[PDB]
Design a protein around this motif. Structure first.
Motif, PDB file in Angstrom:
ATOM      1  N   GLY A  11       0.834  -1.062  -0.065  1.00 55.49           N
ATOM      2  CA  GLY A  11      -0.107  -0.081  -0.116  1.00 55.49           C
ATOM      3  C   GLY A  11       0.853   1.124  -0.097  1.00 55.49           C
ATOM      4  O   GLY A  11       1.688   1.364  -0.739  1.00 55.49           O
ATOM      5  N   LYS A  12       0.855   2.094   1.003  1.00 56.45           N
ATOM      6  CA  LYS A  12       1.408   3.398   1.355  1.00 56.45           C
ATOM      7  C   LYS A  12       1.688   3.405   2.736  1.00 56.45           C
ATOM      8  O   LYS A  12       2.928   3.395   3.123  1.00 56.45           O
ATOM      9  N   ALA A  13       0.806   3.781   3.438  1.00 54.43           N
ATOM     10  CA  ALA A  13       0.710   3.604   4.912  1.00 54.43           C
ATOM     11  C   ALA A  13      -0.680   3.601   5.429  1.00 54.43           C
ATOM     12  O   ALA A  13      -1.691   4.307   5.112  1.00 54.43           O
ATOM     13  N   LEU A  14      -0.884   2.519   6.258  1.00 57.98           N
ATOM     14  CA  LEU A  14      -2.193   2.041   6.752  1.00 57.98           C
ATOM     15  C   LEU A  14      -1.856   1.251   8.070  1.00 57.98           C
ATOM     16  O   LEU A  14      -2.568   0.370   8.450  1.00 57.98           O
ATOM     17  N   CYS A  15      -1.113   1.801   8.972  1.00 59.32           N
ATOM     18  CA  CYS A  15      -0.825   1.178  10.110  1.00 59.32           C
ATOM     19  C   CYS A  15      -0.410   2.440  11.237  1.00 59.32           C
ATOM     20  O   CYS A  15      -0.289   3.415  10.738  1.00 59.32           O
ATOM     21  N   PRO A  16      -0.751   1.940  12.279  1.00 63.60           N
ATOM     22  CA  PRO A  16      -0.417   3.173  13.487  1.00 63.60           C
ATOM     23  C   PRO A  16       1.345   3.307  13.427  1.00 63.60           C
ATOM     24  O   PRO A  16       1.923   2.486  13.204  1.00 63.60           O
ATOM     25  N   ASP A  17       1.564   4.552  14.236  1.00 57.96           N
ATOM     26  CA  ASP A  17       2.996   5.014  14.122  1.00 57.96           C
ATOM     27  C   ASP A  17       3.878   3.841  14.600  1.00 57.96           C
ATOM     28  O   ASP A  17       4.952   3.827  14.220  1.00 57.96           O
ATOM     29  N   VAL A  18       3.475   3.103  15.752  1.00 60.44           N
ATOM     30  CA  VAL A  18       4.270   2.128  16.541  1.00 60.44           C
ATOM     31  C   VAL A  18       4.937   1.295  15.302  1.00 60.44           C
ATOM     32  O   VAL A  18       6.054   0.778  15.739  1.00 60.44           O
TER      33      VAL A  18
END
Length: 21
Positions: A11-18
């Motif tokens: 994808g690109k970015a689709l998770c929490p910062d951690v």
């Protein structure tokens, strides 16, 4: 990785910062 690959590469970015930090 602990979080699913898609968040980093796929994808690109689709998770929490951690997941990244």
């Amino acid at each position: 990785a602990l979080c699913p690959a898609v968040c980093y590469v796929g994808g690109k970015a689709l998770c929490p910062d951690v997941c990244y930090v």
